Design a protein that fits this description.
Pathway: Secondary metabolite biosynthesis; terpenoid biosynthesis. This protein has about 525 residues and is mostly helical. It has 23 helices and no strands. The termini are far apart.
Length: about 525
Amino acid sequence: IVRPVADFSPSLWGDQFLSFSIKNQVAEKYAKEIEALKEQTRNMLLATGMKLADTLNLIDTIERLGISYHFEKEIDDILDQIYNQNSNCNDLCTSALQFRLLRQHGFNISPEIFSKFQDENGKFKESLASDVLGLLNLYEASHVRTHADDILEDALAFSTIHLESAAPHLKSPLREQVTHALEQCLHKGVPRVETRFFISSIYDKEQSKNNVLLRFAKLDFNLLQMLHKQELAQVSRWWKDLDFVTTLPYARDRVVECYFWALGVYFEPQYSQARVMLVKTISMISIVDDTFDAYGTVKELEAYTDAIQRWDINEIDRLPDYMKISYKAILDLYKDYEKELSSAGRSHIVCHAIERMKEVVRNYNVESTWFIEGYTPPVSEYLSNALATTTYYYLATTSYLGMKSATEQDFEWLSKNPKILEASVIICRVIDDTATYEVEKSRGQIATGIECCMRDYGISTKEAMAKFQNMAETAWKDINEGLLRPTPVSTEFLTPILNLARIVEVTYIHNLDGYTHPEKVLKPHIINLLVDSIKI
């Protein structure tokens, strides 16, 4: 057997994350000051007689500064009151911000709030075109629309064209905030990434910044970063001890990138265990993925797929030696998950992730079969297989494993492929397919999504691309509507799904697979989130 040649770039990180010793005196110092600042901030939010605009700005700032996770109850109580009083007497800036915060928190505020800013055709009054703050808030709000928000059909284009026009002559940091928003809207961005940017490049440079809030945001970011670096050191040591980098040299060595994904799914300290479980899973399926794509023969992959279905160490002897390595490691990892959840009496939910893994592997095999047969399925059949091969059902399921309050009922809801999860998977699928179409077209993969699309509908590459683009836009509307109250599960279990979609967007920004080629893509984020602390 002459396997394909190894074409993956090595880890760009070496061992710089392998060992990290937290400075306990610095951490304790930070935690102590944060305690005082957290109470001050709490009192800011509980203050009486605040104007609506000031209240919404306070909440937005605290959210963008990445410290809202300290104030879930307070922010929710305030937004609930605003939602209930339903005042409709403000400017575009405040109205657009009111609309976004409420929607993002699941309050289904009517889009009729925007009517006063439009004419009889539903077109935004082009006389708003010189209101940059209104436009910036309208722009950000345009990305939380649902299928019921056709009143906002023109909002993204209207705000984009006029913000683009105004941007070069804006003062700082507003110019930088606007230019950044045009590249990356807030609602679809990875929360820690947007927080790091907002703290350092924007709020730190605002003339009217609240100093207590800024100080709080920097200390809190840096203190959490310590925990993240601890988790990453731990996972790095775990990965190094597995030594796949030498014994499975064909596969991407990307544990840092895997960690970044887990950090994107949730950054809060209470999700420490959940992150570490998640990154190990992402790492392991990455090995599996590489095995199907760039190494294993038809026969071997058949064996591996069957072994995974049977999920039994007895099957290892049916596998080639190199496949024994990952198979044993996979089974061990899940026994470790079970053991790890034991004291909490939550070992019984691990099986949900296992079953999702089996689905990913089944469908990897189907993808391989289609490839060798030269099969080009219709889009519906293509998606019935290709959605799971994003691994996104599996990752969402995995993200719940270490979440202490995730119950069997939460997993059961997820098992039925709810709309919000389905949308996140579709977004992952269509963006990946869009990005990789030309690469894999030359690779000879006749069963790409775009190809299936062109042949199914009798359309051009450009039309197929656009149709895939529409599927992602539909899916983002489904995600937004899937966040609306009443939620089918606690919001806590929706945000990881939302965050998986956000990671896709960020990872394939500028149309390149960021995880396989982190250099341009993930590397800056990794440096910003896990290497450099925010300078105080």
